[PDB]
């Protein structure tokens with residue numbers, strides 16, 4: 001019935017309800033680093049998160065997300081390949097059952113343990129619902145997670161997950177600073193793509209950072225304790241909620257760095 005990541009409702013099934021699944025600019029993709037072209041005309045990314053207002057954290061049955069106040073230019077992404085101003089709406093993660101899988105984008109076929117998506121929408125379209133219907137409506141900042149040392153800025157997130165174990169649970173999650181999730185370098189790859197979950201709309205300028213962040217085994221283990229199911233249903237652990245790499249087709253990935 002509903003789409004998911006299982007054998008009978010996973011990514012290979014999605015095209016039946018969402019035919020754009022087989023479209024011309026689908027995400028994620030493998031980033032072949034030796035084929036990506038350095039584009040000296042790409043500006044540095046501008047990440048302005050100082051006034052970010054987080055609101056809530058929610059288990060939505062496919063991942064968990066932290067949502068922000070996007071009614072004002074408080075946490076915005078600009079520059080890079082983007083024209084105009086993109087407001088941060090939410091961030092969420094994709095992760096695996098094991099450390100060797102979980103990311104959606106891959107780098108020379110390498111899978112990371114997880115991938116962070118910070119979802120922004122173009123203010124010129126007024127609301128995110130309008131923006132998803134535009135070819136340049138969204139900008140998603142993708143950040144790889146590898147397992148090693150802990151990420152201190154992630155800990156406030158993992159500590160509240162026990163309160164949103166099952167689908168539909170939400171909790172107050174104020175005063176969270178997403179700057180604590182960023183790597184040192186803002187070097188990136190960029191390409192035109194799509195949402196990686198239904199409706200798979202082709203509305204995203206992808207900005208994928210070259211430098212992963214490191215998270216600890218205990219931190220990622222807490223991700224894996226979440227549930228796909230709702231309270232009172234048979235427990236199915238929320239793991240491997242990633243879409244695999246899709247055909248690049250007629251696209252060139254650009255790099256901001258040599």
Ligand SMILES: O=C1NS(=O)(=O)c2cc(-n3cc(CO[C@@H]4O[C@@H](CO)[C@@H](O)[C@H](O)[C@H]4O)nn3)ccc21
Nearest residue numbers: 067089090092117119128129132140194195196197
């Ligand atoms: O996991 C996938 N990886 S992804 O490609 O980065 C992505 C983007 C989205 N987006 C959903 C939306 C529309 O937002 C809706 O309405 C607003 C109302 O405040 C949101 O609170 C709420 O996130 C969602 O219900 N824009 N992007 C959903 C899932 C993934």
Ligand SMILES: [Zn+2]
Nearest residue numbers: 092094117196
């Ligand atoms: Zn995502």
